[model samples]
Target: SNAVQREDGSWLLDGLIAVPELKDTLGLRAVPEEEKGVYHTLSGMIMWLLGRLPQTGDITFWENWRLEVIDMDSKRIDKVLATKID
Candidate 1:
């Protein structure tokens, strides 16, 4: 799903494709519903943060953004930062 491209040459939800459960929910399909709260939170956070970024319209984070933390093992998203496009 992350590989999908629109006519304007852009990708959709690249970060989301890593998790199959998210794709299912986005597609309105019934699948493993576990961790949906996490996905929703992350997606919402990204959208909100992007809205505040200077490059919100021009930049695409599919190849640039990242979720980092010293210890995120507790299922707590410690940080979400926009990095240089890879």
Candidate 2:
């Protein structure tokens, strides 16, 4: 539910909802609910994928996909901007 389009034509995704298509687009595989260790939260999943908790305003890239940590609360990621740049 966090797939909002930005004025810059990028996507503003929420940290609370999971987007299956995004995982596939990012080439990330799925985990089972049976103790697969997938937190399912967008922030948590991204955190694990990057192996680092990104600070706010940080634009970290995974290949062409640059995920910018837009906003956060204390430590929890609240908003993120994703842009595909070649």
Candidate 3:
């Protein structure tokens, strides 16, 4: 693998999040080191929106790291997908 970076010790964190195309790579997946949540869905969890928590903080991380269906024609997020269906 090629090591692409600055020769000197400058910016530590990569600003890849700034790129719209790369937005999919970052989000709730990169929540604060001490952050915690209950969402395990790829599309997003309804728990936050429904408010089942006693206390809460920033949770927009899910949107930031959402799985993108690049096809402009695509719509449904298929978040409830499983091995079997009704």
Which one is best on TM-score? Answer: 2
lDDT per model vs. reference: 0.36, 0.68, 0.25
Candidate 1, 1-86: lDDT as tens digits: 23443465333443333445434424423323345553444334343444542222233233234432212223333223333334
What TM-score would each prediction reach against the true structure?
A: 0.24, 0.66, 0.19
Please report how far candidate 3 places residue 83 from its true position, in Å. 29
Off by over 4 Å in 2: 21-35
Question: Ten consecutive residues with minimal summed lDDT in candidate 1?
Answer: 67-76
Ranking by TM-score: 2, 1, 3
Q: Which pairs, if any, clash in model 2?
A: none
On TM-score, who's better, 2 or 3? 2
- lDDT for 1 in candidate 3 is 9
Regarding TM-score, does 1 or 3 come out ahead?
1
lDDT of 2 at 49: 64
Candidate 1, residue 11: lDDT: 32
- The lDDT, on a scale of 0 to 1, for candidate 3 is 0.25
What RMSD does each model have against the real structure?
11.9, 4.0, 15.5
Q: Write the per-residue lDDT of candidate 3 for residues 1-86, one digit (tens) a residue.
A: 01122354211122112222222322223432113444433222323443442122212223323222211112212222111111
Candidate 2 lDDT tens digits, 1-83: 45777687777877765647456544545422414766666677567666778678776665567788889866667888888
